[PDB]
mmCIF file of C-alpha atoms in Angstrom:
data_model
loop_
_atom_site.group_PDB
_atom_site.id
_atom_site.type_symbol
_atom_site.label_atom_id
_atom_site.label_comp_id
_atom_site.label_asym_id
_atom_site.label_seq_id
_atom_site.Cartn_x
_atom_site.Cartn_y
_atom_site.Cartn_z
ATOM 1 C CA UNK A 1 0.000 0.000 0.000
ATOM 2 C CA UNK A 2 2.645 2.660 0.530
ATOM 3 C CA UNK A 3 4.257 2.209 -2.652
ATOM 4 C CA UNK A 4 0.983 2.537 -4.027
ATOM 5 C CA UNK A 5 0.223 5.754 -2.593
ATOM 6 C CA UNK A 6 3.638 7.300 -3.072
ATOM 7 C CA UNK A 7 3.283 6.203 -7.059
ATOM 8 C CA UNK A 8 -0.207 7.939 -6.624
ATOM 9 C CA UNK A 9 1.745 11.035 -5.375
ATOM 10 C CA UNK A 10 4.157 11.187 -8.046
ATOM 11 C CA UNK A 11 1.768 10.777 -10.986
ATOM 12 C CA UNK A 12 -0.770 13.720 -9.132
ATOM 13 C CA UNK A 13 2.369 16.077 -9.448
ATOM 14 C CA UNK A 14 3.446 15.065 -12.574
ATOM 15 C CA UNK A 15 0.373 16.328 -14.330
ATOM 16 C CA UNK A 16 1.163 19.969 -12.265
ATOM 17 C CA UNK A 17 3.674 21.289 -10.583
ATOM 18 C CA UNK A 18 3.537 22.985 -7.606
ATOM 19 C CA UNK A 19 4.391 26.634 -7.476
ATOM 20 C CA UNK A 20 8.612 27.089 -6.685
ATOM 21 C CA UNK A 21 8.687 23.477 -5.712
ATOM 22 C CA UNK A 22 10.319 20.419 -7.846
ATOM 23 C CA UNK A 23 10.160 16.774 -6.141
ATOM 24 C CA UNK A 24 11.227 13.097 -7.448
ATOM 25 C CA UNK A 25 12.146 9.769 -6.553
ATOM 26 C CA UNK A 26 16.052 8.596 -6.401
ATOM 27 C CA UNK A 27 17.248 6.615 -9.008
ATOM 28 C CA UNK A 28 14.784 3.361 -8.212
ATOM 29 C CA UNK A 29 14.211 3.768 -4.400
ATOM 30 C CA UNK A 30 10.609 5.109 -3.991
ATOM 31 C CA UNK A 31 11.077 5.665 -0.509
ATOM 32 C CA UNK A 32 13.853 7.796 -1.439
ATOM 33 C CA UNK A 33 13.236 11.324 -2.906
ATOM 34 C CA UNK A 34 15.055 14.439 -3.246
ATOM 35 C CA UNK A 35 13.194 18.337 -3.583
ATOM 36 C CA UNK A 36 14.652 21.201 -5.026
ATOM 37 C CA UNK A 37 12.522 24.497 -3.609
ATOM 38 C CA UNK A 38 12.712 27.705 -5.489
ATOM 39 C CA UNK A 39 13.438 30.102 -3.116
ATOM 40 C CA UNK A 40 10.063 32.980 -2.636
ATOM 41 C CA UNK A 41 10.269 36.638 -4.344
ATOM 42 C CA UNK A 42 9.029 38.377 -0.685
ATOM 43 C CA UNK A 43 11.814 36.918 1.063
ATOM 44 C CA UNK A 44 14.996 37.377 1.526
ATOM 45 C CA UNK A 45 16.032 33.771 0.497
ATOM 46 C CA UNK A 46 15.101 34.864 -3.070
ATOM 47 C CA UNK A 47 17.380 33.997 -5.682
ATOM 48 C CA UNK A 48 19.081 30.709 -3.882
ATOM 49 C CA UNK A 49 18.099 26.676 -4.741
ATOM 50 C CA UNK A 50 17.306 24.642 -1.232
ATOM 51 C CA UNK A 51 17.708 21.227 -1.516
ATOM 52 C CA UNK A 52 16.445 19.003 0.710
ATOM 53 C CA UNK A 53 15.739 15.043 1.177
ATOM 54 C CA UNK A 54 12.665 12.995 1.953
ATOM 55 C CA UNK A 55 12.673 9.225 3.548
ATOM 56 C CA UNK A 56 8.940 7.836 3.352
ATOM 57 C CA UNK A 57 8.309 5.614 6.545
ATOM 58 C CA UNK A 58 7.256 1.254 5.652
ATOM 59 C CA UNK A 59 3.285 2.501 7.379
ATOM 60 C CA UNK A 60 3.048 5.923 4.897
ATOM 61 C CA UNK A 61 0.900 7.590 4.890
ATOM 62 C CA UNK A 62 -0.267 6.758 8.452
ATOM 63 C CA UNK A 63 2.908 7.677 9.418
ATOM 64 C CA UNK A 64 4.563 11.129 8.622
ATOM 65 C CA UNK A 65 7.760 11.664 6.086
ATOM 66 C CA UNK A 66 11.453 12.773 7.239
ATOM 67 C CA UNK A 67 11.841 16.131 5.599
ATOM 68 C CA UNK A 68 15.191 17.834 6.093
ATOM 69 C CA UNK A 69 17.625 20.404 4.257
ATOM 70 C CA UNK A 70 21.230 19.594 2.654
ATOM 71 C CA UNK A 71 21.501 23.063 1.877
ATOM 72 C CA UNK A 72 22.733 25.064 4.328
ATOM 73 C CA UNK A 73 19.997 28.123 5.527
ATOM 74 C CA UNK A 74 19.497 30.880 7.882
ATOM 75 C CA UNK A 75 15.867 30.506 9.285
ATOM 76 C CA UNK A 76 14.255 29.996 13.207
ATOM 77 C CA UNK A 77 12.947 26.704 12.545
ATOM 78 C CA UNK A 78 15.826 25.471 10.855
ATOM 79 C CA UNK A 79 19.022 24.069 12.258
ATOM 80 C CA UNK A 80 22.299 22.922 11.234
ATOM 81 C CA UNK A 81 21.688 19.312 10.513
ATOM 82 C CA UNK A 82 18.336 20.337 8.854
ATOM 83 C CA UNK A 83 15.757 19.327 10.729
ATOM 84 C CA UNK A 84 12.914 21.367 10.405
ATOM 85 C CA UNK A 85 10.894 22.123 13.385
ATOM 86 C CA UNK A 86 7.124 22.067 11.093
ATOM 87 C CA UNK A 87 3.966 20.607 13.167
ATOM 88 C CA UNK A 88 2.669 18.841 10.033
ATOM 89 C CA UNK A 89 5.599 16.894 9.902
ATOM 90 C CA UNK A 90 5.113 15.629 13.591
ATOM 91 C CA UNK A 91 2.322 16.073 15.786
ATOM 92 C CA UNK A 92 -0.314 17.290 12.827
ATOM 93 C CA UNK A 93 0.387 14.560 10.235
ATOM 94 C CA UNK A 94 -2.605 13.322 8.408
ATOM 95 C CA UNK A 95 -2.808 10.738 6.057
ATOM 96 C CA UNK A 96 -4.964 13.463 4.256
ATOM 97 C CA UNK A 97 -1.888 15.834 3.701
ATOM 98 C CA UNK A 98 0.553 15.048 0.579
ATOM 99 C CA UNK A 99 3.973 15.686 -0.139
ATOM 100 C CA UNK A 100 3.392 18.576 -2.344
ATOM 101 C CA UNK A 101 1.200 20.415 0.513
ATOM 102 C CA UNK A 102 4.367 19.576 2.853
ATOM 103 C CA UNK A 103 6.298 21.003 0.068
ATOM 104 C CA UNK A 104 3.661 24.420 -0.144
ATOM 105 C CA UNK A 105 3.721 24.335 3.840
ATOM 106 C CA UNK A 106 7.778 24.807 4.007
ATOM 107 C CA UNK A 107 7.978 27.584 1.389
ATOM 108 C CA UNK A 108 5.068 29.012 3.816
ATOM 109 C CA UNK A 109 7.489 28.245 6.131
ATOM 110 C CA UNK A 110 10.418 30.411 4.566
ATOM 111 C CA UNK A 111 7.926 33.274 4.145
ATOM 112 C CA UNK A 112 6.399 33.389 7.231
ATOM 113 C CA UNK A 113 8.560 31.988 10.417
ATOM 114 C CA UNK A 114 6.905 30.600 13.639
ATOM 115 C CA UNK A 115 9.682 32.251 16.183
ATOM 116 C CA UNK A 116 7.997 31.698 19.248
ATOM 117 C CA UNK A 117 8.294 27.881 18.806
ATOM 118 C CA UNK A 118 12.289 28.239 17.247
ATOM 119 C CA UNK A 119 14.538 25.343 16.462
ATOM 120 C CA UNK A 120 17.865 27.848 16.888
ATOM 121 C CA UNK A 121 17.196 30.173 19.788
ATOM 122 C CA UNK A 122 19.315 32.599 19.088
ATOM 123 C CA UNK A 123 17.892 33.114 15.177
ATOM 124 C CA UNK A 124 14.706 33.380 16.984
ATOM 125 C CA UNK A 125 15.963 36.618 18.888
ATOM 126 C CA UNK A 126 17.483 38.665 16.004
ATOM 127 C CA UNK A 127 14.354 38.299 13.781
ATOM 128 C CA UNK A 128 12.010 39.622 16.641
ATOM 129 C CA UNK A 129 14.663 42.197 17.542
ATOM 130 C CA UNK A 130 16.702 43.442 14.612
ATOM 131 C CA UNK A 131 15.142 42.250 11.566
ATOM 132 C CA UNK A 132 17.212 43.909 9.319
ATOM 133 C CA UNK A 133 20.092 41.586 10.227
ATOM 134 C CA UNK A 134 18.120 38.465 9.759
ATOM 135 C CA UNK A 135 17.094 39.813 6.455
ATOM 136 C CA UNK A 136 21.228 40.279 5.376
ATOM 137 C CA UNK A 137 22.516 37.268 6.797
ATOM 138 C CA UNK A 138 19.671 35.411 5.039
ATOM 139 C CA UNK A 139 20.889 36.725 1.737
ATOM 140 C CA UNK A 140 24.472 36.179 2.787
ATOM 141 C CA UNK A 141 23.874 32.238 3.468
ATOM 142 C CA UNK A 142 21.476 32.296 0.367
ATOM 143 C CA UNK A 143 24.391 33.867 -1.423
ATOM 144 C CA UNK A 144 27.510 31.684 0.065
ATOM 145 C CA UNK A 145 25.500 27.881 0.002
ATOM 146 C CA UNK A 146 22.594 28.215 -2.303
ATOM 147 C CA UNK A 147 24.316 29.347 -5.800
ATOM 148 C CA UNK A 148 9.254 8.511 -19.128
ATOM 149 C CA UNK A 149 9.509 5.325 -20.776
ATOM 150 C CA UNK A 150 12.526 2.938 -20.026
ATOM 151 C CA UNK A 151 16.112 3.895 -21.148
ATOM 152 C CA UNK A 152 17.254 1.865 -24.701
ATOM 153 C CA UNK A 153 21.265 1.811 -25.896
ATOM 154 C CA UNK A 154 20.736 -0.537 -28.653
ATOM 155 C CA UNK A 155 23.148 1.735 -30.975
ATOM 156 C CA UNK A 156 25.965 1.874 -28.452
ATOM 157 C CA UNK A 157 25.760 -1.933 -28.153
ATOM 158 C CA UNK A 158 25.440 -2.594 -31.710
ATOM 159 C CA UNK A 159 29.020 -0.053 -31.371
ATOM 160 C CA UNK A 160 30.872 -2.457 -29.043
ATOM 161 C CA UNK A 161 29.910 -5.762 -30.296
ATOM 162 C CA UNK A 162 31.346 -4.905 -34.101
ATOM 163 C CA UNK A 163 34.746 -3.952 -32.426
ATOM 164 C CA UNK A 164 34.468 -7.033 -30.345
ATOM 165 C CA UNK A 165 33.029 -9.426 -33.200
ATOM 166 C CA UNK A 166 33.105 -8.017 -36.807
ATOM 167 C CA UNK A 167 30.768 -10.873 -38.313
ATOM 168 C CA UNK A 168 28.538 -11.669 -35.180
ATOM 169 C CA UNK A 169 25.051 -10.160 -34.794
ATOM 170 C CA UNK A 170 22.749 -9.816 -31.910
ATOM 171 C CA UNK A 171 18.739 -10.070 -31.835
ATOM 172 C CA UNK A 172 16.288 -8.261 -30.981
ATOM 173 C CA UNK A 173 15.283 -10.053 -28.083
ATOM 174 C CA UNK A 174 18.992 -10.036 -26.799
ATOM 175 C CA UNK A 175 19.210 -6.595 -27.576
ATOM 176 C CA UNK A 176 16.571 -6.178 -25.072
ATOM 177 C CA UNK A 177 18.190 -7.924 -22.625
ATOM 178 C CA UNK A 178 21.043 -5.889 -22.477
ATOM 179 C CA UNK A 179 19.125 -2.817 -22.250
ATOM 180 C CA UNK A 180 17.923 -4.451 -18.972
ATOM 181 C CA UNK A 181 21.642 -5.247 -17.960
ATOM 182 C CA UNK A 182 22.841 -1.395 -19.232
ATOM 183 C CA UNK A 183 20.499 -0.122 -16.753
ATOM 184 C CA UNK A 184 20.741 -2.492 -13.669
ATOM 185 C CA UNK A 185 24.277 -1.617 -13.419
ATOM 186 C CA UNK A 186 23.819 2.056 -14.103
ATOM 187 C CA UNK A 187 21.071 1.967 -11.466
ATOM 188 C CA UNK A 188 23.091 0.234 -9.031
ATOM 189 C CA UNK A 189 26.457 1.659 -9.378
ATOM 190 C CA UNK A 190 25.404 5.490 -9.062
ATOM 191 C CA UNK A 191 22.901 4.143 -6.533
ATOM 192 C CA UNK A 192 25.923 3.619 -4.122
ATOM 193 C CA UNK A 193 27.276 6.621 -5.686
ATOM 194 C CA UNK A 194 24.291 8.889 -4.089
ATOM 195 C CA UNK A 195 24.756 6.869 -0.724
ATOM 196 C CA UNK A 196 28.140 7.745 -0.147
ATOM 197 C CA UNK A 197 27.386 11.125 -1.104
ATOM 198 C CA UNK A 198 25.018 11.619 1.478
ATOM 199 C CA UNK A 199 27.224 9.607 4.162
ATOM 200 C CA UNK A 200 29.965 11.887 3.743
ATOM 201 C CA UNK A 201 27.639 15.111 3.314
ATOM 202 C CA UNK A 202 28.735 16.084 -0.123
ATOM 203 C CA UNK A 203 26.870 17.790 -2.875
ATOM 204 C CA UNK A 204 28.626 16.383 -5.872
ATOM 205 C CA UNK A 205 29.221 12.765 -6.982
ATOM 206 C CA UNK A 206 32.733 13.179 -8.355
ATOM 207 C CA UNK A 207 34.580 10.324 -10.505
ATOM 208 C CA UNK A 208 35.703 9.312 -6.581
ATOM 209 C CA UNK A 209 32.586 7.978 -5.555
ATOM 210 C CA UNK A 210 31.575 5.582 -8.972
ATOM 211 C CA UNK A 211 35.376 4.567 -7.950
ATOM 212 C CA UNK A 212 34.224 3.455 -4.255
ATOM 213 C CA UNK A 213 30.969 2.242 -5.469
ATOM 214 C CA UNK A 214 32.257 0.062 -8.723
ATOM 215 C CA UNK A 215 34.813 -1.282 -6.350
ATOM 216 C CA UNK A 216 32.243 -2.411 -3.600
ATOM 217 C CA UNK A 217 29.346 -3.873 -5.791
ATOM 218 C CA UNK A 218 31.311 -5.297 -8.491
ATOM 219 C CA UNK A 219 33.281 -9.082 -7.584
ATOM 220 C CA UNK A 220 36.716 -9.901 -7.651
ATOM 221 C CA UNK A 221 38.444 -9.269 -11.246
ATOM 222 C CA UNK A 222 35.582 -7.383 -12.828
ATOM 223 C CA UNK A 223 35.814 -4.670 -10.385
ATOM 224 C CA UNK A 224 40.015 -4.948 -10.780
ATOM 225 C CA UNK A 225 39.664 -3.885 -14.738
ATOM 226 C CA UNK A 226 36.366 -2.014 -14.530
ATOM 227 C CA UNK A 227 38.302 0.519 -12.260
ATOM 228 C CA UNK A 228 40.805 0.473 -14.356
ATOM 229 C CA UNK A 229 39.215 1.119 -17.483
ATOM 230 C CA UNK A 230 37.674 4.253 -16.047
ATOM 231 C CA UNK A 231 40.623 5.557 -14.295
ATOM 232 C CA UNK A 232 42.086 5.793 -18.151
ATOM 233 C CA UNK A 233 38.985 6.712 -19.515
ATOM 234 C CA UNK A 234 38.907 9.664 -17.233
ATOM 235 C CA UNK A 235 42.404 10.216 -17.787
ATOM 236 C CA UNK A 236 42.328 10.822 -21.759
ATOM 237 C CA UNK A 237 38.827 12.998 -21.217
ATOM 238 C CA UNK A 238 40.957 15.568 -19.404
ATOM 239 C CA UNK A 239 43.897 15.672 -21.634
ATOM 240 C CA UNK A 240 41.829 15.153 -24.865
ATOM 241 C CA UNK A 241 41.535 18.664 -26.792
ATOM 242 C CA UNK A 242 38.423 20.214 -25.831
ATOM 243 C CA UNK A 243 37.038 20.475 -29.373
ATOM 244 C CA UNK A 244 35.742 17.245 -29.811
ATOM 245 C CA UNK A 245 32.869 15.070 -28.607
ATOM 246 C CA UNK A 246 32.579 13.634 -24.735
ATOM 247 C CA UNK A 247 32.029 10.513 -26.046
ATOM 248 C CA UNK A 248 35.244 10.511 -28.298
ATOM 249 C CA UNK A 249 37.427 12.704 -25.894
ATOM 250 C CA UNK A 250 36.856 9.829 -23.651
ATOM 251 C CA UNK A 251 37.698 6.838 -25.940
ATOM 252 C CA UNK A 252 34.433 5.596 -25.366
ATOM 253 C CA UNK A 253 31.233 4.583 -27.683
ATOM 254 C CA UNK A 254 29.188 5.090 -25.153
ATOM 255 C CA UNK A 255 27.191 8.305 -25.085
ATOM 256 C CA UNK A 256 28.616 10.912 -21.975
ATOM 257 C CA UNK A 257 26.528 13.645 -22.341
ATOM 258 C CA UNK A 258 23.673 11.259 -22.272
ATOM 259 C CA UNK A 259 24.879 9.160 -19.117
ATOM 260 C CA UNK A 260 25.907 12.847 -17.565
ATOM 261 C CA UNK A 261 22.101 13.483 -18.423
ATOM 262 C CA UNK A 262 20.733 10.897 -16.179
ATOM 263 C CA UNK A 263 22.944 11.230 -13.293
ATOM 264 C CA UNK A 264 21.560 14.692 -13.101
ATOM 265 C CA UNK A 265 18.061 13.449 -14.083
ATOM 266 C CA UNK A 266 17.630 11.266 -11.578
ATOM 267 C CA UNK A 267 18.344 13.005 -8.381
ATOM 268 C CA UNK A 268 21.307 11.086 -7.572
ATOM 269 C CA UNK A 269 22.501 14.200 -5.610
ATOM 270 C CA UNK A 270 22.292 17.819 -5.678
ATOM 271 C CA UNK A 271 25.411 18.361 -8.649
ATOM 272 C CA UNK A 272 27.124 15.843 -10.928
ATOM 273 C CA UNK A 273 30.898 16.171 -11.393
ATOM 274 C CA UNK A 274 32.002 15.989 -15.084
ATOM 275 C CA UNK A 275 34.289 13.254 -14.367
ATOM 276 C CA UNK A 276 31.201 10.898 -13.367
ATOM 277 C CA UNK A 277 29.677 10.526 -16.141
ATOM 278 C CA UNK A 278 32.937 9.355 -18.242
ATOM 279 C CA UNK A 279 33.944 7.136 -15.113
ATOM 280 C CA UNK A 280 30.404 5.234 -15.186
ATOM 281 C CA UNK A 281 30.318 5.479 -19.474
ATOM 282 C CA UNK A 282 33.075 3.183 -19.081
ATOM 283 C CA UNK A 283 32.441 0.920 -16.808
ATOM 284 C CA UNK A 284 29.033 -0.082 -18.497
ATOM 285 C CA UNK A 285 30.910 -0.564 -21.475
ATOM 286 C CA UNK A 286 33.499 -2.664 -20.515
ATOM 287 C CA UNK A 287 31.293 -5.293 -19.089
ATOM 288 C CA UNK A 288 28.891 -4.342 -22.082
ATOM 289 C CA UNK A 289 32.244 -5.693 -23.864
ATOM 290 C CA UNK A 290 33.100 -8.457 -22.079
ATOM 291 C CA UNK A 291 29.482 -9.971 -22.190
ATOM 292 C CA UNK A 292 28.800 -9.331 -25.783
ATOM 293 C CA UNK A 293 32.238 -11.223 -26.297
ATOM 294 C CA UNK A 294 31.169 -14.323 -24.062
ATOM 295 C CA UNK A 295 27.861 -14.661 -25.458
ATOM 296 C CA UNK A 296 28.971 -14.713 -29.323
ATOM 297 C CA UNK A 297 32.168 -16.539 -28.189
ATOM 298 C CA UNK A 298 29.211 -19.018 -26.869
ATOM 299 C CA UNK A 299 27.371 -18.630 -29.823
ATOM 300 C CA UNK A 300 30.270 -18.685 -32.353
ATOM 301 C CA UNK A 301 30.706 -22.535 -30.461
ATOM 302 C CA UNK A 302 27.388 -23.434 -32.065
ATOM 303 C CA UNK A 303 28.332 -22.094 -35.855
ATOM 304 C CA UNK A 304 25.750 -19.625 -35.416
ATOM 305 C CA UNK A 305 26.027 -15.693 -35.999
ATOM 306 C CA UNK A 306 22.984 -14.183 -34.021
ATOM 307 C CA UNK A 307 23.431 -14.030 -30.375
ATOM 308 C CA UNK A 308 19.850 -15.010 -28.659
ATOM 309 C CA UNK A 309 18.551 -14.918 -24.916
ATOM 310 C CA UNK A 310 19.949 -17.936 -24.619
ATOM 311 C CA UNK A 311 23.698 -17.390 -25.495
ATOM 312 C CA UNK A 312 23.568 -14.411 -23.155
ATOM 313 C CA UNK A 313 22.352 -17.111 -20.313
ATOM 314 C CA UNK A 314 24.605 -19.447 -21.145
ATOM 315 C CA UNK A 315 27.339 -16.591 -21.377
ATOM 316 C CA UNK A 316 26.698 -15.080 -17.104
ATOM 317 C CA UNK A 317 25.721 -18.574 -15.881
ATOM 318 C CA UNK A 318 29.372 -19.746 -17.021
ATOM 319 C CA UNK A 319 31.186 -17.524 -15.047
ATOM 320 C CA UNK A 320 31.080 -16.905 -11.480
ATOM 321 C CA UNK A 321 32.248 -13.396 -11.299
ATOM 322 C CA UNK A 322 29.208 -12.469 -14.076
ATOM 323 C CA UNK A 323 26.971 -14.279 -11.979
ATOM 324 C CA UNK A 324 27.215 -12.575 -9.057
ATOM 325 C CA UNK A 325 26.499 -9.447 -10.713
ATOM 326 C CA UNK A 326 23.990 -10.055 -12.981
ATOM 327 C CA UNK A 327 22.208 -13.590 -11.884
ATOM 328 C CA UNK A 328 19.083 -12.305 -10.343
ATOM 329 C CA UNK A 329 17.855 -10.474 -13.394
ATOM 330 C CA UNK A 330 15.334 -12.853 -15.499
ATOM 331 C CA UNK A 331 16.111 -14.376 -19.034
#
C-alpha cells in the first residue's frame, strides 16, 4: 500500500507542478526522494536553490515523512543538521496531507517563520529584535550555500559488439536484454554513488565515488579492470583537446553527455561532477564488452552468428564473477 500511494503522489504532481517546488524519486528507491525548492520573491532567500531530502516511513501515509535540508539556511525553525521544526511533519500529520502540501507548507514556512516555537534560539531573537540583520545574513547564506519510458542503448551496443566481433550479430530479443543489464548496473552503481554522497555530506558525486561504489558492488576481477578502465577513460577525457565530442574525448562509444544526463536526471545528488559521467560510461561498457564477447564466443561454439537470450544465459551462468552481478535479473 505505501508504494501505491507514493506512485499515486508522483503521478498527481506530474500532471502539475507545484508553485517554486520540484520533487522526485532517487534513481529506483521510492522511498527515497530528493526536492529542489525555489526560493520565494518576498523573502529574503530569493534567488538561492534549497535542496532538501525525503525518507517515506514502511506505514506511509499513516505515518509522517522525514523532511530535512542539505543546503545550508538561515531561518528559526531550521538548524544545522536540517531538521525542520514544522507541526505537520510531527504532531499534525494526516494521512490526508501530501507531499506537495508539505512542500507548499515549508515555502510558507520560509515566508512566514513561527519564532515563538524556534529550532535555533538565538535566530529566533534577532528576527524579533533586529530584523534587518536576519534579512542580510539570510541573503548572505542564500548567497555563500545556495548558488518517461525505459532507457534503450541498442546503438551503443550494436558499437561495441562490431569492435568485439566483426561478423557476429545480436537479436532483438537479446538486444533487449542488455538494455535491462545497461540499466541495472547504471542503477546500481550510481545508486551507491548517491549513498556515499550523502554519508559523507557532499553535494557532488565526483569520478571518486563511482570509484568506491564500482569497487564495492562489483566481484573480484571485474571490479580490478572495470576501475581500471575508467581511471584511463577519465584520464584521456581531461587531456583530450576540448574540441571534440565527450564521447570521443573519452575513448568511449558510449554516449557521456547522455549518461551525464541521467545522473543529473535522476536526483542522484544535488550536482554531478564531469568526471562521473565518463567514469560510469566506461564501466558499463566494458562489461557491455566483455558480455557481448562471451555470449557470441558461446554462440560462435554453435556455428551460429545471431546471439539469442539464450547465449547471453549461457554466457553469465558460465562464469562466477558475471553471476554474481547479474544472476538475479530474469532471461
Amino acid at each position: 500500500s505505501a508504494l501505491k500511494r507514493i506512485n499515486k503522489e508522483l503521478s498527481d504532481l506530474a500532471r502539475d507542478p507545484p508553485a517554486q517546488c520540484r520533487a522526485g524519486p532517487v534513481g529506483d528507491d521510492m522511498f527515497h526522494w530528493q526536492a529542489t525548492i525555489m526560493g520565494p520573491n518576498d523573502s529574503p532567500y530569493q534567488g538561492g536553490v534549497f535542496f532538501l531530502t525525503i525518507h517515506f516511513p514502511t506505514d506511509y501515509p499513516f505515518k509522517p515523512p522525514k523532511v530535512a535540508f542539505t543546503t545550508r539556511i538561515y531561518h528559526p525553525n531550521i538548524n544545522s543538521n536540517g531538521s525542520i521544526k514544522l507541526d505537520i511533519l510531527r504532531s499534525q500529520w494526516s494521512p490526508a496531507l501530501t507531499i506537495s502540501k508539505v512542500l507548499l507548507s515549508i515555502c510558507s514556512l520560509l515566508c512566514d517563520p513561527n519564532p515563538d516555537d524556534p529550532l535555533v534560539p538565538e535566530i529566533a531573537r534577532i528576527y524579533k529584535t533586529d530584523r534587518d540583520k536576519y534579512n542580510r545574513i539570510s541573503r548572505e547564506w542564500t548567497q555563500k550555500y545556495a548558488m518517461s519510458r525505459k532507457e534503450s542503448y541498442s546503438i551503443y551496443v550494436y558499437k561495441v559488439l562490431k569492435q568485439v566481433h566483426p561478423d557476429t550479430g545480436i537479436s532483438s530479443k537479446a538486444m533487449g536484454i542488455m538494455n535491462s543489464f545497461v540499466n541495472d548496473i547504471f542503477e546500481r552503481i550510481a545508486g551507491e554513488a548517491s549513498r556515499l554522497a550523502h554519508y559523507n555530506k557532499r553535494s557532488t558525486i565526483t569520478s571518486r565515488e563511482i570509484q568506491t561504489a564500482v569497487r564495492l558492488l562489483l566481484p573480484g576481477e571485474l571490479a580490478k579492470h572495470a576501475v581500471s578502465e575508467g581511471t584511463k577513460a577519465v584520464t584521456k577525457y581531461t587531456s583530450s583537446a576540448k574540441a571534440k565530442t565527450r564521447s570521443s574525448r573519452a575513448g568511449l562509444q558510449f554516449p557521456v553527455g547522455r549518461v551525464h544526463r541521467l545522473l543529473r536526471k535522476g536526483n542522484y545528488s544535488e550536482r554531478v561532477g564531469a568526471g562521473a559521467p565518463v567514469y560510469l560510461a566506461a564501466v558499463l561498457e566494458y562489461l557491455t564488452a566483455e558480455i557481448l564477447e562471451l555470449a557470441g564466443n558461446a554462440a560462435r561454439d554453435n556455428k551460429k552468428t545471431r546471439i539469442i537470450p539464450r547465449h547471453l544465459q549461457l554466457a553469465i551462468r558460465n562464469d562466477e564473477e558475471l553471476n554474481k552481478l547479474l544472476g538475479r535479473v530474469t532471461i
